[PDB]
Design a binder for these strands. Structure first.
Length: 178
RNA sequence: AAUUGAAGAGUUUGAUCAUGGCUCAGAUUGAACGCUGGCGGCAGGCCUAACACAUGCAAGUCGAACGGUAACAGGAAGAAG
């Protein structure tokens, strides 16, 4: 494993072995026929890249944002989460293409994310240990509207209005105020 | 007018009386447990570890004390939305 050639940026990010604990030095080789790709990767491996890329173009797909959002093509990234190599592109891809908050359906209406008036829905009451409480802390999604600490909300099911104060924000498997 | 209220029974012996302990009926509870459980009023609720505590809150207030401008507000010598 020498790295990955980016098809759309037309350049080659070079993998360094065992820097998986931090982020390695970004070391690019610009051209796909740049004779430094041959030097940095060995001309043998360099041609197999060129060969495979030929076949790839005749049997694959161009990334189309519309078909991706329709769930009909997947952008495939090759990498290694252990070597911490490939993660950041798929992130660039994540930020670049992936939807802002989407509308959730209800027995009333299509609920736009753009709307105001808070509208969350739980979805999980995680395996609450939890360092000094039963807590439970139900995990809510927030479909629309802005939550603010002292606001008053309505539990639709029990039809009882509830005031909110202690409302967790989870900084990675960890309660945080708030 | 304002403290004027006191019950005994069971068991030692073949039987008896006396002694004498044990036990029972009452009232009481910050109670617990078992079975059960429909309301409401009022009150009560760590008696054990003065054992250790995540999180929020439980003490601040005066510009008619003072230098003052960091915010929202009125208006300004001048330009104007």
């Amino acid at each position: 494993f020498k790295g990955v050639y980016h098809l759309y940026k037309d350049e080659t990010y070079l993998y360094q072995s065992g820097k998986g604990h931090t982020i390695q030095e970004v070391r690019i080789v610009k051209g796909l026929n740049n004779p430094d790709l041959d030097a940095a990767v060995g001309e043998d491996l360099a041609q197999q890249l060129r060969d495979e890329l030929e076949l790839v173009k005749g049997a694959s797909n161009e990334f189309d944002k519309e078909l991706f959002l329709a769930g009909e093509i997947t952008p495939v990234f090759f990498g290694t989460a252990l070597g911490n190599f490939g993660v950041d592109h798929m992130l660039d891809g994540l930020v670049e293409w992936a939807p802002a908050p989407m509308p959730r359906q209800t027995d009333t209406r299509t609920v736009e994310a753009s709307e105001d008036k808070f509208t969350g829905f739980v979805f999980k009451i995680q395996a609450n240990m939890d360092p000094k409480h039963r807590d439970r802390v139900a995990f809510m999604r927030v479909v629309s509207g802005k939550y603010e600490k002292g606001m008053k909300l309505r539990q639709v099911r029990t039809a009882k209005d509830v005031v909110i104060s202690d409302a967790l924000t989870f900084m990675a498997g960890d309660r945080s105020h708030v």
